[PDB]
Design a protein around this nucleic acid. Sequence first.
RNA 1: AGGUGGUGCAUGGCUGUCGUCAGCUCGUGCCGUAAGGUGUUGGGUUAAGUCCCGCAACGAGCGCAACCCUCGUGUUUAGUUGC
Length: 116
Amino acid sequence: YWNINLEEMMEAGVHFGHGTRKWNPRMSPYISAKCKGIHIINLTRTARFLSEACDLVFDASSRGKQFLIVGTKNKAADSVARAAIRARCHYVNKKWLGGMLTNWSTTETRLHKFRD
RNA sequence: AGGUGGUGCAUGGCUGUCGUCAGCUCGUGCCGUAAGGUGUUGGGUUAAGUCCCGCAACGAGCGCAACCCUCGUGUUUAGUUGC
């Protein structure tokens, strides 16, 4: 059991806090305290900044706009590969080649060469 | 008309030379105010930016290679002034 059964239940488990002394002083209003070296991120402001982030993507999916989910990191590669097949959107996974999001015209010629 | 008269530091054509060395560049996209740079760097590897990996680089063009000519094996076809 926890406090309440909502979205704040799963976020209060093992889904918060990361950086240890490698932080950027620009993200200062987005933290609570520094417990045992690790910087604990505030769940009160994340829930408000997740709401306005979920309001614009819902206002884009109703129109029929396309999304792109990038993730070349080893600890996030397997989760980025499954989430985009279910959503039918663009995704990068393996080695990141310089110029994929801007140079779509030069990289799609390689995709047509794969089909040739 | 004629000039093997001057000037190839006025020139065409052609050549040596470093060199067969292997480099020389471009499109798109990024970096910097900009001139430019990145790709043509790095780690190894080959005769060779040859190739692999890494990497805002991703691809491409000239060069390298190959395609052409002989030599080394055989096979098929045709045999004189060949055997």
